[PDB]
Amino acid sequence: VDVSLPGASLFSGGLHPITLMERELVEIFRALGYQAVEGPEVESEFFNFDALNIPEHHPARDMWDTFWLTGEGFRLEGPLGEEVEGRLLLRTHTSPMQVRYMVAHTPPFRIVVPGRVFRFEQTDATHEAVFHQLEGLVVGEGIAMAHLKGAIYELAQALFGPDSKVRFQPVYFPFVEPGAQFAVWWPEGGKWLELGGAGMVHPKVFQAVDAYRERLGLPPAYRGVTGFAFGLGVERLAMLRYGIPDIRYFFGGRLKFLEQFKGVL
Amino acid sequence: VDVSLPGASLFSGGLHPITLMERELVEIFRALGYQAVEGPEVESEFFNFDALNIPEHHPARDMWDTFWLTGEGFRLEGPLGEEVEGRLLLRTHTSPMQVRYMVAHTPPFRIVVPGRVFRFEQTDATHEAVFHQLEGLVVGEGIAMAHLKGAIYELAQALFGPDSKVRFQPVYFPFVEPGAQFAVWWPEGGKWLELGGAGMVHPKVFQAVDAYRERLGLPPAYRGVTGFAFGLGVERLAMLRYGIPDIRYFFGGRLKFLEQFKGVL
Amino acid sequence: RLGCRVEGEGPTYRVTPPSHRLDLRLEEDLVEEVARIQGYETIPLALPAFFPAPDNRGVEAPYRKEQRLREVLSGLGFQEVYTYSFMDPEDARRFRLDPPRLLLLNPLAPEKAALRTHLFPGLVRVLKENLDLDRPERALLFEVGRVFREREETHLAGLLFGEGVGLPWAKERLSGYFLLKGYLEALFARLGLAFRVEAQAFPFLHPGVSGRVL
Amino acid sequence: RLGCRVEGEGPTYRVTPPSHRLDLRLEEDLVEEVARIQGYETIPLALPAFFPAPDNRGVEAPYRKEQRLREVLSGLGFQEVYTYSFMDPEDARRFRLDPPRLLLLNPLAPEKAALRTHLFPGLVRVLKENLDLDRPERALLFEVGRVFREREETHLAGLLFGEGVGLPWAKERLSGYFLLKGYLEALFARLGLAFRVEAQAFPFLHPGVSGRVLVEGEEVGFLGALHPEIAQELELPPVHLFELRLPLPDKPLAFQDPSRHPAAFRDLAVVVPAPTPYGEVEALVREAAGPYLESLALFDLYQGPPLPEGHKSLAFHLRFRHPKRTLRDEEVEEAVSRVAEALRAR
């Protein structure tokens, strides 16, 4: 028989690059003992802004261009399966999960949170309105910044390197003091990449957590513990890694593009 | 149309329980920062016995009933891709990999080593001749036994628990002083399970490593560092976990059995 | 040097900030300071080690569950796809389905003014535009996303189209509904779940060829 | 208390063990002691934290590689199997293959006196015994294991048998060799590796239905139908196999922007001798298509009454595209010839 002939057309599946990058980022942190958990895309103004030291009428509330929602009979669930109130919106970043988690659990712990977030900016090739971020939070007594620095460093090594290194510059965020923006050393392309933000969890956030916990009847758990959190852009990274040029490409359901990552692993 | 009808007979794959258990054990240790690496099934008497403080004519060489090999033109590779000499055999346990790794690398590190091992005993329902083990080794300055104890404890918690706990009894092994055999608390079935052995790497093993390293031209790397290693029976555990009764069942290529683990994950 | 007044003998001091500094209120704000002045680069690198509090034990289960699934699909032969969480209120009509319970107060466009209640409308819609750009003979794919009804829900939908599978050169094909079912059955076979379908009336589904899943 | 003599003032002491203690030679032997006497349970629990030395960085890659693969298979539809690493020297005969380079000095049984050189003999052998115990209509499975030739090698083989897939009630089936190939092609499609087969003579493989395998650009393993002679030397009907060597090579993806300008479509057939392998055919057409050939598929062929008794027909669908702009017909019916020319000009 002619064996060189084509076989039965069988469907070959693939995975979306974001899922791929997500998975890689996760496997990485998993190795440092972090656990992956998810939050809801539709949040309450309380968890997205209030919980985190973000003010209503001040310049902070003005760094995130939000998508407000309307509609009735929609049930929003709280960390404990309780109904919560607040103006509904689309989570502006993944940070809210920092709170839902801390309310529902006891330190010490390490978590990482992947998630689709939403912002109202105009879509260009390096910026979008629907993108994903990965949040990280480590809380425990004794936690210090050097740990946040170590954490991030292990991430760079794991991604590029060991000829790669980490860059931490001070920046401001309402929910972490000290705040910082961080870049990674890409030995290959030879340039610095601004990856995300991080810092030492703000006292007011721990406060908020316990306060809501007692409101729910739980005892305070975050008095006297410390912690750091960070969050990074996944598309910004997937693009650099898998060599994609247009961030808009991700949500453009074109197969010719999608299939290009079939065998990424 | 009749939609309740059967669709196109499409093949549904599955995975072997050992692979499943392997994977689970691995994912577990991966989370503590261990890395998975493999060794060769056909070893040299040197790596299997000599390297580890195991004597030729003494009672130690007599705890493992070995399978000796013969045949020419077979090329056995050393940690560095060099040809090594020694009477050929089938690795009696995975421990040899402790050495191949230490020769090829620099501490500090954490590794775990899954592997099919071979022993000459008679096959009953709890004992076989062809089984798998999982070896673990952590070397670094400052390593102590409490770390080995912690390690194992995290394993129990991860498998059963947190209402589960760990049992360490002194036992003897040529390659580790202090030696120990360890059992885990199974809250469910309510009994203690003897899982494997472990201990603090023996000085003579570190010695052997450096000695062979210099023989190969490499500088000594294990002077002044410490370490613990352990090794456990995978079938013994898969059986308890996936509720299998006959260890002989694993190598019995019966589908009716194999398929029973299709959806284990 | 920053213009703070530092009284007290130690170990805890009385530090009064200059008034032009409105960002300096807590002790931590004060720490961020020693940090940046000394230089963030001067903070060493370290790694923490601790036994996680018990209630954190199983946490990853759900996430992992979803992923093994996501993974199995791509392996069974489904191309993964990512669709915007938005919805054109109009399609609630175009596709015979109830209306979106959530709407935007600041929609990006009147065609993305609602929140998807279903996942498939989007898949189908993707189907089309692909046809218009490149002309794929067949297509099998899936998507996992959050739909919004009374509560936020994680849904999974898959779409099949084309001639089907069989010999390319050789005439016959084997495709259509019973092909999509074929795969489905296999998938559960792989997940260790017993599945079956029963005919059910679905507004968006041609009847006779409609069915609920069990 | 254990009968040791302890001299010295500290911090390092002179400890002489009693003579009945032969196990006590090093300082560590001494430590194991304080331990067991104080009680192993009295040792606290801790966790170490450190940055691993650099040369340990990538270590997991190979292992992981194998696993993603193992995983993909089970997902594609293959039941995994574990086979003993042993071999009955006798089968070296039963299955037309060279002899095992390694033998046991203490075999468990004269039927497990050698070390498997191939994986498939075992799969096939498993096939049989299953049939005898439970009667499966069809079976698709794989196994990954260590075979022993000059050097220890990680192999991967898969076996298919049965009626095949299709409608259970409905008559037709679609199975056999081209089914096993179907899956294979899909698997690489999923791995991002370009694979193809070329007819090759294999002692254990029925010829005509025999073929060597070419993972992306390379020769590794084979694929084909089990030679009937063996099929029958064993109470077994027909079986289809393939066995490769791991690790599979990998092509690091180079992402590439697809162009928006619609492609150039074509209808084309080729008439070439009945013996010619599809291979060289596709090959040529392809290598002459030009640099803008987006697609190349085969929708049909048959020997054919309306043409040379010794030639065949080939339905080839063609597509073309230019990234920056649309393809001017001038270049299309032009390049088309570029092919037809050297097509049978050859």
Ligand SMILES: Nc1ncnc2c1ncn2[C@@H]1O[C@H](COP(=O)(O)OC[C@@H](N)Cc2ccccc2)[C@@H](O)[C@H]1O
């Ligand atoms: N429009 C957009 N499109 C795509 N990626 C975007 C984006 N806007 C921001 N990003 C990416 O998403 C990341 C997070 O957004 P950004 O607003 O900068 O940080 C927001 C916090 N979630 C990060 C943080 C967490 C914890 C402690 C401190 C900081 C950025 O680093 C950026 O790389």
Ligand SMILES: Nc1ncnc2c1ncn2[C@@H]1O[C@H](COP(=O)(O)OC[C@@H](N)Cc2ccccc2)[C@@H](O)[C@H]1O
């Ligand atoms: N015949 C057999 N069949 C199945 N499982 C067996 C077996 N013989 C032993 N095992 C399992 O395999 C495990 C290892 O075998 P064993 O000979 O007890 O230890 C041997 C060392 N490899 C373990 C070790 C490593 C490092 C430091 C100290 C000890 C045992 O705990 C047992 O559960």
Ligand SMILES: [Mg+2]
């Ligand atoms: Mg400040």
Ligand SMILES: [Mg+2]
């Ligand atoms: Mg002793």
